[PDB]
């Protein structure tokens, strides 16, 4: 019999993405696995305006009851695509409203390796981005001088309904930005458990990576992670051999971690930072490893009834170049591992969270990796890792398909 | 011998303050009268013992002389109290410096020898806003509650009337409030110094910000394009550096992380906010070799108009190699990132004061002409010419016989 897919969100989006998964789903999965549980959202810019981000509130509704989520790369409407693409409104990034409709604690940016071919770190990279909180919903405003007050109004403890002043300044500029944001750090005692966690299961070294010294108000990310740490993981730590007796947790300051990034081209280590660092930080990482493609975007998130909401994406975009090529009857030559990884990833996490044909689908998705490897090593994988010689986009979906 | 203009010299400890006082005793002191080099003591215990009056006092002589030379110290944290035994942990001087005298920008630029490869190919030019964002926020950290900010501006036709910037509900038992601002006047000046350097340079610039996520950052690169688009265009393609029709570069802070990692060619110039600013130069300096390997000048303005400026290495004492010296055992510290900074800033005393200008110029060529040339020979230190490389004082002996 076929695989049951266990009940998992697939979000469709457009261009050359989009074409690849079609045959993919059609000759790779379908074939193999009954997808029956699956509910699929078109998210393609038209239908997010077409439907009034209906579709959007959709998929997130499936997403709290299904709690795992595959997306295609997406193209965000911005004012640039509504004039391209013929729409009747602009509508924001997806990210935020997911990563809030999901109680999202963080968006783990992995390093994705292929077994026979060396890429920049030569061991699995962890990274945890804090997937709330900072600039990211910053409240602000462009002003000239005047007079710029905080007030904080506790709702509970002793001092609850009294007005205390977080700061007052004056603005000497004719021009000037004024600024407010905040951190909601209970959630950080989930991500050290999840980081920590990782880690450990990964055998890599945790580092926490703030710029606490100057940013004072981030030392509760720290004081967190230590606590969680030194209660719950450094013995486990020390047993399996990832670290020493009398080794502790380390800080590194961001500006720092550029630098470690570059460093450590050996890989087998792992950080958590804030929303901010954790954008900058990443990018870095996947250049260094070699291009955006090669890091996830996994968005983890806590379910009220305990369990995990995971949602994965690959880390590029819909590839309109590409799809341009194609339709000038060019040949292209997609590599399909980043977004391969995420429906992995969506799969197992699917299989796992309802308990439905565990065994059967990590053998699969097993399987898919093992074969994509395995073509790579021998020469036939796409053109960005094999050179000219590399198989087509359509070449190697058949590739892999005649193997698995 | 060289009458040396008054100049602030800063003062640290560890590898670095025992290296310069080799350099004064033996390439400065015998060829120049330093009499007007005011000197302060910022140890950690100092700055712990004087309760930050020397830095007080750091801050006033600057403002007086405006040409500052500062060797790296140690920044009484926490644990540098307990290593230390200090009273108290102390935040770094920086923004004191910084906020004191009105700093403009922070230029770290690439250290370049000819004949010597490091990981930049041509020149790498950055321009760091020197104040403002999270730098100088106000905070706290709080429980369940409401978080209000107001604006009342002081000019124009709404003078008087207070505004809400922001109002939100905490959740969280344990969240931090921050506000900060970005003083944008001075993007201004900061625009032109950046240009003219990469227009001197020939060098591609970029602007570097997250305008498009953190909207509140629109300004930095409106100011910078109309400065640009007004006073350099024309000039950066006249100089072979673009083609006409070609516009000024916005990169996304993200995106340059990545730039700096692939433009290994270089030729390259960059201009961010403080904290881009920050964390890119950290970066910039370790595809290039280490941290020391790029220049760190602050350019402030006295309010009489006159540029005050301030130079350092990009890097720390070097606690270990002190350690090390101190059990009688080799080390081979590079001193050329200090030397840059002594050079820029007798150059700028020089400039200012009117003091043996031409002699003081020529002093600090060769300086740097007879360092670069033994690094040409094999006969610098072991971090660019492996264990055949000198010791720190095998070098600084070398350095100073050919003076
Ligand atoms: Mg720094």
């Given at each position: 019999s076929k695989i049951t897919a266990a009940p998992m969100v697939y979000v469709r989006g457009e261009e050359m993405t989009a074409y690849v998964m079609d045959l993919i789903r059609s000759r790779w999965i379908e074939p193999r696995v009954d997808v029956g549980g699956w509910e699929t959202f078109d998210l393609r810019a038209k239908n997010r305006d077409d439907t009034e981000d209906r579709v959007l509130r959709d998929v997130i509704e499936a997403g709290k009851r299904i709690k795992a989520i595959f997306k295609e790369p997406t193209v965000t409407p911005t004012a640039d695509q509504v004039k391209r693409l013929g729409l009747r409104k602009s509508w924001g990034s997806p990210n935020g409203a997911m990563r809030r409709g999901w109680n999202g604690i963080t968006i783990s940016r992995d390093t994705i390796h292929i077994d026979g071919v060396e890429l920049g770190y030569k061991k699995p990279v962890l990274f945890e981005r804090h997937a709330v909180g900072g600039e990211y919903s910053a409240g602000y405003k462009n002003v000239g001088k005047g007079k710029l007050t905080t007030t904080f109004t506790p709702?509970?403890?002793?001092?609850?309904?009294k007005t205390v002043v977080v700061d007052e300044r004056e603005i000497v500029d004719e021009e000037a930005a004024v600024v407010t944001y905040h951190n909601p750090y209970d959630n950080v005692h989930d991500l050290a458990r999840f980081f920590f966690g990782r880690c450990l299961e990964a055998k890599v070294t945790p580092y926490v990576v703030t710029k606490?010294?100057?940013?004072?108000?981030?030392?509760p990310f720290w004081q967190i992670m230590r606590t969680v740490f030194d209660e719950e993981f450094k013995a486990q730590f020390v047993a399996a051999g990832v670290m020493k007796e009398g080794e502790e947790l380390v800080h590194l300051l961001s500006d720092a971690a550029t630098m470690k990034l570059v460093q450590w081209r050996q890989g087998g280590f792992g950080m958590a930072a804030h929303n901010y660092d954790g954008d900058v930080l990443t990018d870095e990482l996947a250049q260094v490893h070699?291009?955006?493609?090669?890091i996830t975007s996994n968005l983890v998130g806590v379910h009220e009834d305990g369990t995990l909401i995971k949602e994965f994406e690959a880390?590029?975009?819909?590839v309109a170049d590409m799809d341009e090529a194609r339709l000038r009857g060019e040949e292209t030559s997609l590599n399909p591992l980043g977004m391969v990884e995420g429906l992995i990833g969506a799969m197992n996490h699917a299989a796992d969270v309802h308990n439905i044909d565990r065994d059967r689908t990590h053998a699969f998705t097993t399987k898919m990796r093992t074969v994509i490897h395995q073509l790579f090593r021998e020469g036939?994988?796409?053109?960005?890792?094999?050179?000219?010689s590399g198989l087509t986009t359509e070449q190697f979906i058949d590739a892999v398909a005649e193997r698995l």
């Open positions: 709702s509970e403890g002793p001092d609850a309904g606490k010294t100057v940013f004072k108000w981030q030392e070699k291009s955006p493609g090669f880390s590029h975009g819909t036939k994988g796409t053109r960005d890792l094999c050179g000219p």
